[PDB]
Every structure is written in C-alpha cells, then in structure tokens.
C-alpha cells in the first residue's frame, strides 16, 4: 500500500486521486479504466436506445441522443431521415461495449497489478512532469491520433457512404461528398466571423462541403503539429510563460474543455446542419418561425391578404421588415429572422420572403413540416411534460436539443470552476505557498503600509 | 441454431460475470498468484473466442 | 427494438446504462472498507 | 461489539435507502398521482 494513506501522501481520502500525481503506472491504469467507462456508457446507452426504439416515430419523440449521432453520419437512414436499417446502430453499440470490456481489463491491470511507476521499467513510457521535451512528445503523439480521427470522419463522408445532408435537393438524404471546401479563405473566415446574431462564428457552418473541408484541414494541421511537438522542445518565451507541472497541465486542459462545452451547447442549440432537425427536432428559432408559417398558411387559405395584414402594433401581422430591410415573419419571431431551413428557403428571394411564392407555391410537405415543428418546439418540464410551463399533463416530450444543451452547459461551467481551482493551486504550489503562509516569513509583514 | 446462439451468448454473459468478480480479486490477492494467473489467461482467451463465435453466429440466426 | 435473436436479454440491456454510477458508489464502499485512511 | 463490520452496515443501509427512494419515484410514474 505505497502512498495509500494521508500520513504518507499528504492528501486526505476525499482528495485521494492526488496521491497518483507521481505514480505513473497507477495513473495510467486510472486513465485507461476511465476511458473504459466512457466507451462502456456509449455501448450500453446505444443498446438501451435501440431496445426502446420505435422506428416509425421520429427519433426526437423518444428521448434519443446517440442514435441521432449515428444517423447523421449516414448510417441506417434514408430519404427524409427515415430509418431503413437499425443494424448499424446495434453494431455501434455492441462494438463499443466489447471494447469497453477490453479497456477495463487494461485499466484494472495497470492500476492494481502492474508496476506502480513506469520510469524504471521503461524510459519511453515513463515521464517526468517537468521534462518539457517528453511532455511535448506525448502531446504530439496524441495530436497525430486526433488528426487521424478527423480524417476518419472525412473518409466516412467521401468514400464510405457519405453523410446525411438535410439540404440535399429532394428533402434530405444521405449524400457522398465529392467537392470538399479546401479554400482557406472560407475555412478560416468561419473562425474570423463574429459570434453575434446573424453571424454565429463557426456555429453557422451550413453545408457538408465546408464541414468536410474543415475537418481535412484539422486533420492535416493536427498531424503537422504533432510531428512538430515530437521533434521540438518549448522555446524560451513559452518556458517563461507557463507553469510546468502535472496540475498545471490538467488546469490548461480544464480550460480548453470548458470552452469546448460552451461551444457545443451553442452548436446543438442553433445549428440544424450537423444536427439535422429530422433527428434532433427543430431548433427553438425553427419552431417559432414554423408557428408563424403555419398560421400564415391557415389564414391565407381562409382568404387573408397576408402581405397587407396590419397587426395590433402597426407592424405586419404575418410579414414585416428586419432592421436591414429583408422581408421576414412578424410577431415575436422577428428575433429569429436569421433562421434558415430547407422547409423555408424555397419561399425566400433576394429581398427575403417573397409574397408571390407565399401566395402560390407553398407545398403540402412544407405545411406539414411547419405544423410538426411548431408542435415539437424545444420546451418542456424536468419530468418531461411537453409544452409551456402552464400546459397540462398529456404529452411526454422534452427535446434532445434541450437535454444536450442543458447538460453540456452544466458541464462546461463546472469545468471552468475546475480550471480556476487547479490553475490557482498549480501556481501556488509551484511558488511554494499552497499549504499556507509561513509564519516566520509572512510576505505582507515586509511590505510598506498602504497608508 | 437459435437456442445454440442464445446458449453461446448466455455463456458469454456468465463468463463475463465470473471474470468481473475474479480478475480484481486475483490481482489484489498476491498470495493466489500461481493458479489464478492461468485461470485469468484461459478465461480471457475463452472470452475472446466466445465474442467471436457470437458475431459469427449472429448472421446465422437473425 | 433489438434484433429478434437478442430479445431474451432485453431486461439486462435495460439496466446496463447505470453501471458507471455504480462504479462511483463502489469507490466509497472501498474507502469505507479501508476506513478512509 | 464489532461483530458486524461498520462498512458493511453502512453499505447495506445505503442500499436500502436507495431502494426506498427508487420505489417512490416508480410510484410517481404509477398508480395515484401519475396523471394517467
């Protein structure tokens, strides 16, 4: 029981995992076991979803979050997102589960039975947190692996089946991407776009060509950077800029992951390209716009001249102008005039929504889709009662977009707290005062008074 | 082969339960480290074989 | 639904997802067994 | 005295509390108060 008590390690049980900071073998076991946990959940949850899946009903009516991910990749679905074959879902679940068993075996071995420290057994796998060269070598290895993952996505899109394209001409379909966007102007203009309304930063990516080109660039950049960090060691300015310790590296990663969690929240809330509404349900903006469209259709069928219908406030009841003049839906949904979706874009012309097209060319499938999205807006209670808070019990529905956005905002925030905690502690421990103030050398006592 | 496949899968499940209990106990029991090592190796091999046998037979039942 | 061949295991699949939470609890059971030393 | 280990006592008692609370949530979805 080496270092497995507070007396010998300095750490209490509630901080026990800090006892592993300098025990590389047991720490490797811990990480492999936790990765086994991740893979195991993927497999078990996917199998649970499949066992509870009703193929006829939309995915988003059934509390599914993983099957939509598989379907977006082009597996198991056909035109309009209809499910034609669930065996790909089942295969994903089974394979992840078996792999989880293997990972668990490896992690338990490295954590319980294998060498406690790897430095003596091997210098390739052993490391010292303060060895900047070795640290950057491991970082580069994992960068190469990640780049390979991005290129795997590219391969799925280009050579093995393609991806589900909600924008495909005909009403959404699996499509093979053959002309990925390699234009750096486009790819990095995305990064330079403002995050505010009508711009959306990277969350605004609205076509699979741009998606695939972006991931090509990510894979190549990651491979090059990993080779760089294998072959180099940090320069002097970096050495003087950073804290070089295990806790500091953990803190940096906590900050990065928090940022990624917030970004994912926005991605799933706003983007209907890589999160097709056929699978994840309408976005909030989409559902609001859909209500506007639905009642425009109903009243126009009754005989209203929607272009000229004046609302109570003087603004158009069904149609008005955005602050830059585009014709848009009226009512509160004026805030959502940046929304774009395949069921709506056929009605849009150069100046915005086109009155002639609204009058003459709205199709039954558009009417049906608008009704569906309006009635599956992402609003619901914690006990999964669909609709506004004042609605009565009857509909058992909370949108996958709501579940995913809320969960990952919670995770991103707590990981920001983690960044702050571990970064502050890393600084204090590197400087040597993380256990408190030295009584005989209290820094403030040697400073001049403020007044 | 329906019942045969079900039996093979049930054997996989039971063997997984046995391994899940036994591997950590053996690892944390340094005294039992002569017979238990062979047991663990044989169980790992048989578990892999059963996983393959299922999967192969999945396409012969349904 | 699962493929027909696997229907007999449906109750097991129904419970598999919570095992990670069980692991978190197991950590506390173990520490209790060692007295939180 | 200490015939039955306290960690066993704590684990079993926690399992019992968990079972009771879980049954209460099951009731939330069944029988009276289920909205159905």
């Amino acid at each position: 029981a080496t270092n497995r008590d507070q007396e010998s390690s300095g750490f209490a049980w509630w901080a026990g995992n800090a006892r592993l900071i300098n025990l590389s073998g047991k720490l490797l076991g811990a990480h492999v076991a936790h990765a086994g946990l991740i893979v195991f959940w993927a497999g078990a949850m996917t199998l649970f979803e499949l066992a509870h899946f009703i193929p006829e009903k939309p995915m988003y009516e059934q509390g599914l979050i993983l099957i939509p991910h598989i379907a977006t990749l082009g597996w198991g679905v056909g035109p309009g997102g209809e499910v034609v074959d669930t065996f790909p879902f089942f295969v994903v679940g089974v394979v992840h589960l078996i792999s989880s068993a293997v990972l668990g075996f490896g992690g338990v071995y490295h954590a319980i039975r294998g060498p406690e420290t790897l430095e003596e057994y091997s210098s390739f796998f052993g490391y010292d947190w303060k060895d900047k060269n070795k640290m950057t070598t491991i970082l580069g290895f994992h960068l190469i692996v990640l780049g390979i993952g991005a290129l795997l996505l590219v391969a799925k899109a280009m050579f093995f089946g393609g991806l589900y394209d909600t924008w495909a001409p005909g009403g959404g379909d699996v499509r093979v991407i053959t002309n990925p966007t390699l234009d750096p102007r486009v790819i990095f203009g995305y990064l330079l776009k403002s995050p505010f309304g009508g711009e959306g930063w990277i969350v605004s990516v609205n076509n699979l060509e741009d998606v695939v080109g972006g991931h090509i660039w990510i894979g190549l950049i990651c491979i090059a950077g990993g080779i760089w960090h294998i072959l180099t060691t940090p320069f002097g300015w970096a050495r003087r800029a950073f804290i070089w310790s295990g806790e500091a590296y953990l803190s940096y990663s906590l900050g990065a992951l928090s940022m990624m969690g917030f970004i994912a929240t926005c991605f799933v809330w706003f983007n209907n390209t890589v999160y097709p509404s056929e699978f994840y349900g309408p976005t909030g903006p989409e559902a609001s716009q859909a209500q506007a469209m639905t009642f425009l259709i109903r009243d126009q069928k009754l005989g209203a001249n929607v272009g000229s219908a004046q609302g109570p406030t003087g603004l158009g009841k069904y149609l008005m102008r955005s602050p830059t003049g585009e014709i848009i839906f009226g009512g509160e949904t004026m805030r959502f005039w940046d929304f774009r979706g395949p069921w709506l874009e056929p009605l849009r012309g150069p100046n915005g929504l086109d009155l002639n097209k609204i009058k003459n060319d709205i199709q039954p499938w558009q009417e049906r889709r608008a009704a569906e999205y309006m009635t599956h807006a992402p609003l619901g209670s914690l006990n999964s009662v669909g609709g506004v808070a004042t609605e009565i019990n009857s509909v058992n529905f909370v949108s996958p977009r709501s579940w995913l956005a809320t969960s990952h905002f919670v995770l991103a925030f707590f990981f920001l707290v983690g960044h702050l905690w571990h970064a502050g502690r890393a600084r204090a421990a590197a400087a040597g005062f993380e256990k408190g103030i030295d009584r005989e050398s209290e820094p403030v006592l040697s400073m001049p008074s403020l007044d | 082969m329906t019942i045969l496949f079900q039996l093979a899968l049930a054997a996989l499940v039971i063997l997984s339960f046995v391994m899940v209990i036994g591997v950590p106990v053996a690892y944390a029991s340094p005294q039992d480290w002569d017979r238990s090592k062979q047991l663990i190796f044989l169980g790992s091999g048989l578990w892999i074989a059963l996983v393959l046998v299922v999967g192969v037979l999945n396409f012969f039942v349904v | 639904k699962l493929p027909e061949a696997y229907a007999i295991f449906d109750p097991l699949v129904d419970v598999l997802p919570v095992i990670p939470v069980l692991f978190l609890a197991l950590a506390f059971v173990w520490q209790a067994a060692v007295g939180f030393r | 005295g200490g015939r039955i280990p306290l960690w066993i006592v704590a684990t079993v008692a926690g399992m019992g509390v968990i079972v009771i609370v879980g049954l209460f949530f099951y009731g939330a979805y069944a029988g009276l108060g289920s909205s159905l």
């Binding site: - | 209990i21 944390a28 | 109750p11 129904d14 059971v29 | -």
Partner: peptide
C-alpha cells in the same frame, strides 16, 4: 427480471470488496 439483474449488478461490487476483506487482500 430487471430487478434480479440489477440486484446481481450491485451485489457484485461489494462482493469484490468483501472477498478481498475476508482474504486479507491489497485493498
């Protein structure tokens, strides 16, 4: 069925701990 399966999955862990305690294992 589900109750029995979960009972087994849930006795397993404390079972490992109990065996290692009875066996003077490296807990």
């Amino acid at each position: 069925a589900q109750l029995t399966m979960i009972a087994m999955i849930g006795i397993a862990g404390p079972m490992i701990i109990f065996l290692l305690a009875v066996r003077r294992g490296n807990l």
